[PDB]
Amino acid sequence: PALDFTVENVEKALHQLYYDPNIENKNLAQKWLMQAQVSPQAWHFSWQLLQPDKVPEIQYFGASALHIKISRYWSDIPTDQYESLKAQLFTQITRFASGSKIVLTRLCVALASLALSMMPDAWPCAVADMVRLFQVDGQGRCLALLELLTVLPEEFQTSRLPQYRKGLVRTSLAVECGAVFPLLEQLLQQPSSPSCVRQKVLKCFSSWVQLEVPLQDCEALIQAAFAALQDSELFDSSVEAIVNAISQPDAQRYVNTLLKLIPLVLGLQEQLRQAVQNGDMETSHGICRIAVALGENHSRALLDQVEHWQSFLALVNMIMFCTGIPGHYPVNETTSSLTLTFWYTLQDDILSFEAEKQAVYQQVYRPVYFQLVDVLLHKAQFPSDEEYGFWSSDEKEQFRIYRVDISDTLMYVYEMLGAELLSNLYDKLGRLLTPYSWQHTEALLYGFQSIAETIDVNYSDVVPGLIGLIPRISISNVQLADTVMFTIGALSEWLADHPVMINSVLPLVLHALGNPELSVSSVSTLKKICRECKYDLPPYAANIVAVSQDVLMKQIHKTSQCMWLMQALGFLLSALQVEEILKNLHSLISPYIQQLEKLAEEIPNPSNKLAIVHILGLLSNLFTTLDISHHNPVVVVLQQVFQLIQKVLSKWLNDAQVVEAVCAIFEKSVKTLLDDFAPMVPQLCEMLGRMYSTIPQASALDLTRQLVHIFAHEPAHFPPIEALFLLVTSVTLTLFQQGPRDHPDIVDSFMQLLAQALKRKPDLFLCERLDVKAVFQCAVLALKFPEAPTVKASCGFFTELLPRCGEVESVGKVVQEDGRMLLIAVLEAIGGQASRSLMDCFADILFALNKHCFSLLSMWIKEALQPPGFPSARLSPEQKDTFSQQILREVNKRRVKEMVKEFTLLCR
Amino acid sequence: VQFKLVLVGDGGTGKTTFVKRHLTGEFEKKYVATLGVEVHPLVFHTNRGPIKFNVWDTAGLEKFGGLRDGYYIQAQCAIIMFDVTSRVTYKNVPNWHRDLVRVCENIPIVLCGNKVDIKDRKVKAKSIVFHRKKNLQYYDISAKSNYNFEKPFLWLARKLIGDPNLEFV
Amino acid sequence: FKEDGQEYAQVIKMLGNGRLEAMCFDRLCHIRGKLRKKVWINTSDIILVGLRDYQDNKADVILKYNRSLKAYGE
Numbered sequence A: 001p002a003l004d005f006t007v008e009n010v011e012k013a014l015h016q017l018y019y020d021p022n023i024e025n026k027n028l029a030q031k032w033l034m035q036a037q038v039s040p041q042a043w044h045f046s047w048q049l050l051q052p053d054k055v056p057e058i059q060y061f062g063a064s065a066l067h068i069k070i071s072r073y074w075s076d077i078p079t080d081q082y083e084s085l086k087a088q089l090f091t092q093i094t095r096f097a098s099g100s101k102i103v104l105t106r107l108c109v110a111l112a113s114l115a116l117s118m119m120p121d122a123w124p125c126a127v128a129d130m131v132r133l134f135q136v137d138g139q140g141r142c143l144a145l146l147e148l149l150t151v152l153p154e155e156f157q158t159s160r161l162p163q164y165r166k167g168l169v170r171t172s173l174a175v176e177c178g179a180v181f182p183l184l185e186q187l188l189q190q191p192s193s194p195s196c197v198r199q200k201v202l203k204c205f206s207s208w209v210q211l212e213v214p215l216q217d218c219e220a221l222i223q224a225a226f227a228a229l230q231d232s233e234l235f236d237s238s239v240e241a242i243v244n245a246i247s248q249p250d251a252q253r254y255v256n257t258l259l260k261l262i263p264l265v266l267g268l269q270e271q272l273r274q275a276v277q278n279g280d281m282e283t284s285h286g287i288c289r290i291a292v293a294l295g296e297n298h299s300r301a302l303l304d305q306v307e308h309w310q311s312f313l314a315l316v317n318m319i320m321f322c323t324g325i326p327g328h329y330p331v332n333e334t335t336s337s338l339t340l341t342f343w344y345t346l347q348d349d350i351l352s353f354e355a356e357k358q359a360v361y362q363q364v365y366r367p368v369y370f371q372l373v374d375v376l377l378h379k380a381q382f383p384s385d386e387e388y389g390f391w392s393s394d395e396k397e398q399f400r401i402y403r404v405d406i407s408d409t410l411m412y413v414y415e416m417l418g419a420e421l422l423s424n425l426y427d428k429l430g431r432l433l434t435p436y437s438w439q440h441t442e443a444l445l446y447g448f449q450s451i452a453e454t455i456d457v458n459y460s461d462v463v464p465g466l467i468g469l470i471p472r473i474s475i476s477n478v479q480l481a482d483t484v485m486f487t488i489g490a491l492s493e494w495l496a497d498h499p500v501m502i503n504s505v506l507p508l509v510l511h512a513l514g515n516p517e518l519s520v521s522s523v524s525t526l527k528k529i530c531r532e533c534k535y536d537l538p539p540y541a542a543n544i545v546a547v548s549q550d551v552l553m554k555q556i557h558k559t560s561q562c563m564w565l566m567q568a569l570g571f572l573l574s575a576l577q578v579e580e581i582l583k584n585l586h587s588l589i590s591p592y593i594q595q596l597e598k599l600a601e602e603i604p605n606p607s608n609k610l611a612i613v614h615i616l617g618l619l620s621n622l623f624t625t626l627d628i629s630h631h632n633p634v635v636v637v638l639q640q641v642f643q644l645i646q647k648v649l650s651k652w653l654n655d656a657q658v659v660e661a662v663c664a665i666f667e668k669s670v671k672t673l674l675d676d677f678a679p680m681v682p683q684l685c686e687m688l689g690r691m692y693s694t695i696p697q698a699s700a701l702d703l704t705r706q707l708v709h710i711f712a713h714e715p716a717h718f719p720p721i722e723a724l725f726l727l728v729t730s731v732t733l734t735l736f737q738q739g740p741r742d743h744p745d746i747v748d749s750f751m752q753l754l755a756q757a758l759k760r761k762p763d764l765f766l767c768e769r770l771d772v773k774a775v776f777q778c779a780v781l782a783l784k785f786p787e788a789p790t791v792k793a794s795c796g797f798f799t800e801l802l803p804r805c806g807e808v809e810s811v812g813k814v815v816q817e818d819g820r821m822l823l824i825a826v827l828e829a830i831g832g833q834a835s836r837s838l839m840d841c842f843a844d845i846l847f848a849l850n851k852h853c854f855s856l857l858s859m860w861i862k863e864a865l866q867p868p869g870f871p872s873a874r875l876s877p878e879q880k881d882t883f884s885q886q887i888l889r890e891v892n893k894r895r896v897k898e899m900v901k902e903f904t905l906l907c908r
Numbered sequence B: 001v002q003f004k005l006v007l008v009g010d011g012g013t014g015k016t017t018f019v020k021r022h023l024t025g026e027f028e029k030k031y032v033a034t035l036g037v038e039v040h041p042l043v044f045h046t047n048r049g050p051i052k053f054n055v056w057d058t059a060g061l062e063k064f065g066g067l068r069d070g071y072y073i074q075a076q077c078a079i080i081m082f083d084v085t086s087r088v089t090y091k092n093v094p095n096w097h098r099d100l101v102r103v104c105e106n107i108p109i110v111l112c113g114n115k116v117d118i119k120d121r122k123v124k125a126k127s128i129v130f131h132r133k134k135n136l137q138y139y140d141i142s143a144k145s146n147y148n149f150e151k152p153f154l155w156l157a158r159k160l161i162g163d164p165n166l167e168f169v
Numbered sequence C: 001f002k003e004d005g006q007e008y009a010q011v012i013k014m015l016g017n018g019r020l021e022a023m024c025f026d027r028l029c030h031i032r033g034k035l036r037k038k039v040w041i042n043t044s045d046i047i048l049v050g051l052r053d054y055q056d057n058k059a060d061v062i063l064k065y066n067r068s069l070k071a072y073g074e
């Protein structure tokens, strides 16, 4: 059974793919169509699909097929058919003037692709030829022409070509731009042109300025586009054209036209003023996009040209006006957000100038920025509760993110204004605290929160008084309280240096740990406190653990929130004296162990699962941040834990999540204590070794790697870890036989382990159990993997192993015995079997081969290159020799990457 | 309710793993280049009722691209995906948007940044400016840690049905 | 080692307030907050900045160099 690639069959297949509900039917139809598109018969049937007899859904495939035949497979198209292929397209495009827009666009894309594929010399004047060819409808002909001319430059931005060809095309295209522009200018200038056309003109112009085109040439179309802004149907087109022509990178050099642009943008002000009043969001939004597009893209130059300081100021004001548009951003006005970027740039530019002139400009724009603070704090101010509750969830989130962006801009504003701003904020807040709406207080406090973290201690006079004000603030409303907590959390680093103030803020935060509505803030703040102010915290600690116990006893916090509290308590205990710390930790973990005992004895239940996970996680988090080493009783607790852990593991081995959670405790506890992790090593190796024999898990490999890197040098705890390593190697390699690509995580992690081991203790490779040949086989196979990070890790291992040769006889013999295959695999990878991103990770290996074993690499490369077209068929016989001669020399490491890049670029 | 969603974006992004994560609830560690289009129906429960999104999973690699734009026809909406750890994917975004608009102009599209869960991030969160349109919104999704899993489909469902109040069951 | 969107630079001038003017071997450089306070940069010192996508003129000081780069040949 078979279906020849004819129009009827292709059409039936299209109808099936587009309408048949069966998945496999679509998957079959689509494949048969994959064949149909590439098939030669396509050249005949495509046109027949474009006939008026068929639905647009069918016609479009006909157009797309052509587009793909030309774009993907241009090399196959014979030279004699060229003209025949061109002309045809044109004619069809003409027919689709009144036809479906989608198909017309696809055909124009196709013709553009053909043009670019024969742009350099074969089609000398494509633009002028299109113009002449188009000049039965007349208006639709112009529209089609404009669509083509619009698609032409963008299809170049995505056309994949070699550097020389790409440049050679870009030049000839730049030549054509100057022929396209007048056609656009004339069509716009003439009053006999309809809006439908003018839009296509603006879009065409905008599509052309996406390429690096001299602004001085664009000027006329800029003027016309500014004129078109008064028209309602042309606004969205003209604004995009204007912005795309102004915001372009090359426009920075042309200051002469950029100065002539300024008075035009200031002209839009009355249309902006009316739009803000009339509630026309689209218009004010567009006009603001224009204003900012000028501002942020030409600020430094506009300031440098001091002779027009008056204009720029006005511009700034306009932008300021767009910042202070009455109402809130999410709903009332879409404008304000767009403004933010500009402000930063201006600040930057003003700080970029030499100090002498910088003072001159700062004297002008400092009050502008002080006004910017008043504006931004008022807009970020929450609306009334009655109104806010009515906002769309999307709108609330929009305002949240928006508020984050403002919080970000205030951070730089502080870098500009300095302590004076802090003084103003403190004075305002004090004035407010000393009807009454929390929104204002929370606004100022939000500004203070945004700024506080970046504030230096050198000029921090406001901070003490601020901390003085914090308790005076009402905890009535939740948002204000959250802002308070976050503000404290930001003040943490300052609170560490001045522990006398801690007593005034601590109870305010500990109270918030009780309320469930503040969970995210409070805890975080507490963590941020405990992590920063640890040495001075122990006198207050008795109440902290007590309140932590009560707040945890009640189900006030979600689990993920509790975890942070466990980390916090870890940081807290890290400072306290040993005995008291052990007693307190025992007290806090005592209810947790009892619940763990209760879950283990019970048969594995779905309700019990999450309950066990919670305890395991709380333990892990408690262990992550508790470190008396300040780079241990935690080991004492770990020993007692080990039995219950073993029972729980015996009961819940099959559950992957629970197992991972159980391993996590050891992972964190090991990462925390470097040298103090030794007295638990013998017990840990037996637990992990049995766990890895049952089911392979990458986390276990990583843990073994950590144990290796930490405890290698200390021999006293080395013997048990050695057995776990060798066991792991035997289990992986045997698992790898069943499925190579089946478990990339395990492979990647294993490569990490072997690399760490090769670096830390090369002698370990001498042991007999490990199949040093099979390992090398697995790593050699790893470079072929489609998973990128696994390949990268294998490359890392390779990079580590090479200098170890000679120093270790196992590595030397292994490399001598199986060395050629590795270079074969690397050359295969460079040839085109690997992505271009990991190339630099591959090259490293090669470089190492030069640094460790020149004599072997010379012969290996020499032999590997001999067969014709080994890495790639495109490679010439002389190029193999140039790569050989280059790579041979005993050469810097960085140049090898460049050589490799050029080679792989040539191959692909 | 039936709505066709075309899932596009650069190759190796992890969109197939997202779809698989939603269909089976299992994250797949291994990466296989998707050939052509992978059509899978995903159904989400809502207070209005059940909404069905027919996901056409597009090839990202150029060589496996296949029919390409031909999948886009009749799509009510789209999801563009990029890898946070790789800048090139983000650089290619306007290209995917451009091809999508040509076939379907005003359809709601969601931009998704993935592998955010990964410690090292190549793309800062500040850079994203795609959501500046009314029919566009950005999300940080993590197919592994399941962070913001339903968010794109939720936003799309709301914008399509016409009910901003619509929530997931 | 340098990454994409990042150039290795050497300090040319000082602007203060966490800002420096420098000339990459391949612009204005900006050093941020606590990291900038912790490490003092000087003129003609080796550095490494990350290019900003919006403006090629401005970059962010990412790493302070203490010799290996000369051996690398970057």
Ligand SMILES: Nc1nc2c(ncn2[C@@H]2O[C@H](COP(=O)(O)OP(=O)(O)OP(=O)(O)O)[C@@H](O)[C@H]2O)c(=O)[nH]1
Residues within 6 Å of the ligand: A787, B010, B011, B012, B013, B014, B015, B016, B017, B018, B028, B029, B030, B031, B032, B033, B034, B057, B058, B059, B060, B061, B114, B115, B116, B117, B118, B141, B142, B143, B144, B145
């Ligand atoms: N860390 C992390 N990795 C992810 C995540 N999502 C996907 N990945 C990675 O992406 C890989 C899967 O690739 P695929 O989903 O097959 O990529 P694709 O969507 O098929 O791309 P195409 O073939 O072009 O269609 C996995 O091996 C993961 O390592 C994530 O959320 N976090």
Ligand SMILES: [Mg+2]
Residues within 6 Å of the ligand: B015, B016, B017, B032, B033, B034, B057, B058
């Ligand atoms: Mg896929």
